[PDB]
Symmetry: D2
């Protein structure tokens, strides 16, 4: 297949002020001697490097894009949010919102991240590639129209969708968000809309803290077009496969997407500090295969994967590689050195059965019929 | 209370070859730009820093200790193991076992780590302090007598207990291991002994990978004096409180320890990369209060906490501080900034009930119902 | 001897926003993947750690101090500077001046750094120790009353001296500044004063860039009580010894200090990125011995060494250790692993002779008589 | 101009054991919390990043190359040296020589580094490009045929030249080494050869420590075809411009090279920890312009620049970018933020005159007056 890889080196240069993991430094939180801010470029840089030495980058359609225009940004964000962000960015950086720290030139880099998402959807809708992967940093799926949060400063996917509707007139877009945290920004923006189906798989109560959201299925015109699957902390491969089979694929069947966008965070991986799930790289590969198959059946193959979270520098690269291998249909020589180990750590039969029963009940609560793909 | 804090700066100088998290650099694992090895000194360094900035250090009895002697080390490890270890340490470093990488001078630092645990048990048994905390790096609880593993190179706790028995004649010691991984080293060494009650709370199947171990309760003379509590991945405060109340405290009540040693890893904390559990600093505070209460009821208050794992640089310091506050009975001005956040992320009622039912069934299997 | 070591762990927690070495990140300067800001705590932390494993810390009078009061700070700085700094500090950090970046809680840490300097002078004047070393971070010697610069936010030494005059009534204080950069703050503050002799040895034109300053000997009441020795870039051990013998010791002889304060930066060391000089740890040891001897002859031994610059994490600890060994009269087992190597790199005879002749001429320009110590 | 840029991502994955700057971690040198080894990949990584963000990459001919063959390597190094190197690389790493530490897989990466230099010379000799830049890590110019040193494990330039001579029959090659340290490897290999003019500009006595070398002009057949210019520590733009104008360009004029290779270290830059010189990005720009002009006058424009040292993560990228701009004749939007600062810090008139006089005396000693 022809997979477009949207990347820009400048996205790897965004960096907020001092933070111990996610905690802003100051008060009782000592400055890290080595690491720094959780939303680090290193994870994304190590993904890019691995894609290069694996030979996969050479088999992709490597592309950049112009930064998002104010016009594109103003579809979702107000001008005063843009001016504030810009002011803080030009001032040297600071705090923009709830866990939304920025540095100098963060405005420009945020615009570029959104621009990559816009271009990726565009390329796939124009027929310039069968599918695409956008290595967007900073990420977007937590950002509300007037509030930065969770290290997201623009609602990247929303911005790209609004631009895609204005340029191409696409009527039905499915957004599957498998970042381990709740896609609250996407949910809120499209909550009363039936032209975008927003699905989030997330760790129950992880981020935003305490939010599960199963009963939040959208409202009025959007009722049934938002679906939250709050997975129990500690779940892994089987929990996600069962979620994909019992909820996601049936929701997609009913919706008939013309384009599928995946908010692909890799923070459900088994060594991530910011969640408690147990996925391995083959979990991501299998989720991508299922969504690629869905895109081929409904949307003429039109699939865009946008990079969101993932904070294990060691392991995120293997997970991202697996997704890109699956999009492109090229298998590299890279073997995941943690895969066998993570297999042994998975929930036991009793726990897996408990989670399976909860997903069966959730599928029934959503009114989803267990048919197969066609 | 008089709390002894055993520490040596030189423990913070042990450093392996290049690793990304726990993956040795080589093949497809790129060298890290910044971090380096999983068992970094920075977690233990940041705890000590927080203890000093909080002022708690001024209220502790600060102590150090000589390195462990060969005599002490030879109560558990063979001469050839020491030789092999020292040769590799002198050679610039390498891999002494499975997930057991060492740097130059790692032998001498491992001896210092073990000596601190020996000295801390001795201090408490001699009445120099009511209780103690040993900042022992590298850790010990995975180390077998002739096999390093899981970043452990000597069986620190075992060596300390064997030394304490030789020195003081202590008859009953309980070891509570709340490091999130299974205390396989301690379990193996004392598996057929009834003078040492070994209890491990651990994430089911985490490390060693795939091992749960509820069925392994000891053998012959030690039958009933080993207890594994394999907790479901994803559990947090309630799971550990229920494990403590239904299993640990009743087990300790029955054994009547003369001394309690805690293998205190902090890797059950909610942001640790090496496990999937959801503890906060107050969970560690409460587990310390509970075991301190056990020690006061059976052991004349004689409790030693030996630092084991914990790989969140950001959060381990707050968990360690909570333990030391509870040991000393002194509350600093430090407030855990993640505490309220982690409370909100805890397992829901259904998951809590599921885990509770499993612990009830397990306590009945152990005959503690 | 009884050497007081003024230290607080909290001084090692100060950390500005993102900087590649000294360059603020943004524009063309990529965020460092590992290091971070030049004014890093690591150098000072590695000094403390080395003092501990060497056994030297156990032989010192280890002390902390309260933070500097507003009253102490207001002797040199205006209230509006304090309020601005505080505001920026409470806002999360930012830029306070010319190469003066701050983080959150920097105000509190800056106050503590000044407080350590105040307490060190006080302890030595009170007779509580023969001499003292203050591990002050952030440093002070570049900071003007109303302008932060060169990573200095309060004029630490000036603040401590003004407090010492108010508390103890000390009449003559010599400040020897062997940090490799020009002590511009101390110079400016005491420029028309004869109660403080300010001497700076620095790399000619290094920082502030282009400033040599040999002709700037003080004015009116202060004329002859400021001395700048601009050493040629590339100089090392011999250049500093000749400066000490031909300029510093004679200036001290004439001045008759009641207290000597050393602004001890270690950035003249041979591997420092922020200067081009070639000192080794025995250079610092010899400078300390000469100033300790001067303090014993004039000032009843009253000597305070205040830590200023030094940005080689590998080597600064060895240089600081040498100074503290010399103050205390305790020789540790630590041997400097670069000492022999740095010896071989020193300027050749021709270059050493060129520098010596320039220093002879400068001594004559200052009207300094080449007598010996008595 | 058509500028070939030879690069491989995998060169940025070579990483030694723990070092503080150039000091091996062990004894009194504490492990770094953050940095690690002097010869870090981050300087070369940041140059490549800056080349991409500046857009200059789009105007270069991007190339890679196979690793050097044994045949190519054996033109300079013995089989046993390769064996010893590969055994130590396979063993997890260690010390292959003096100031020559290696990690796991370092052998394969060193071969790739050498192959890039071979390919870059070949490309320019074949007319595939007018000139070339090789981002060869690890570096080469200190490496002797049977002794690694100064973080160099193969003599990259020597291997490339020997390969170029075997492949193309090139008769006269000039090597200009403006790395701040002495190009001892190149000098030794070609010391008695007149087919290779080796010139080193270096800080007097820096590395190897204590070596100046003005008197060492080659021997027998090579007498006059080695030139050392030992510059006083502390010099900057003017010292290097005067060295180029009075010594390098007249030497090149006399030799009439058919190809010019530059061993381009950037460690003469004003903020480098491993030397005491005061160059800025425009000094490197001007040295490149001057040698490019030499190459156009004698060598049909055939110039290859091989990356050597440079240990300022912050500043080397701007110096490297300046060289590549000058090679390609394309000026990016990147502005060197230290440029004006470093201008102000330059030696004063008296020091400049002192150095100028020494270079005049040296040029007369070489017979270039
Ligand atoms: K999600
Ligand atoms: K919707
Ligand atoms: K355990
Ligand atoms: K037992
Ligand atoms: K100075
Ligand atoms: K003065
Ligand atoms: K050179
Ligand atoms: K030659
Ligand atoms: Zn996430
Ligand atoms: Zn553990
Ligand atoms: Zn300085
Ligand atoms: Zn060099």
């Amino acid at each position: 297949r022809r997979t477009a890889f949207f990347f820009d080196e400048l996205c790897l240069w965004h960096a907020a002020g001092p933070h111990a993991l996610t905690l802003p430094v100051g008060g009782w939180v000592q400055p890290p001697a080595a690491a720094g801010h959780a939303e680090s470029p290193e994870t994304k840089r190590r993904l890019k490097s691995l894609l290069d030495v694996s030979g996969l980058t050479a088999r992709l359609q490597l592309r950049s894009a112009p930064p998002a225009s104010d016009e594109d940004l103003l579809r979702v964000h107000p001008a005063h949010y843009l001016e504030r962000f810009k002011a803080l960015s030009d001032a040297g950086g600071g705090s923009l919102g709830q866990d939304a720290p920025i540095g100098p030139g963060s405005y420009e880099i945020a615009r570029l991240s959104a621009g990559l998402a816009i271009a990726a959807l565009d390329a796939v809708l124009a027929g310039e590639a069968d599918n695409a992967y956008s290595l967007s940093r900073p990420p977007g799926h937590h950002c509300l129209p007037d509030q930065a949060m969770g290290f997201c400063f623009f609602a990247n996917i929303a911005v790209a969708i609004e631009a895609a509707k204005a340029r191409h007139g696409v009527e039905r877009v499915a957004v599957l968000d498998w970042d381990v945290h709740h896609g609250n920004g996407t949910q809120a923006i499209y909550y009363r809309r039936d032209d975008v189906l927003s699905i989030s798989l997330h760790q129950d109560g992880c981020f935003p803290p305490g939010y599960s959201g199963a009963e939040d299925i959208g409202e009025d015109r959007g009722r049934g077009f938002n679906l939250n699957v709050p997975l129990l902390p500690g779940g892994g491969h089987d929990a996600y496969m069962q979620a994909m089979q019992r909820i996601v694929l049936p929701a997609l069947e009913r919706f008939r997407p013309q384009l599928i966008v995946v908010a692909s965070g890799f923070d459900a991986n088994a060594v991530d500090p910011l969640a408690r799930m147990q996925l391995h790289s083959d979990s991501f590969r299998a989720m991508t295969a299922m969504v690629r198959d869905a895109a081929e059946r409904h949307a003429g193959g039109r699939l865009v994967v946008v990079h969101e979270g993932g904070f294990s520098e060691a392991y995120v690269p293997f997970c991202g590689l697996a997704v890109i291998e699956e999009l492109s249909g090229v298998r590299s020589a890279v073997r995941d050195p943690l895969r066998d180990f993570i297999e042994l750590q998975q929930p036991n039969a009793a726990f897996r059965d408990f989670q399976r029963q909860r997903l069966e009940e959730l599928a029934a609560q959503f009114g989803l019929c267990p048919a197969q793909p066609l």
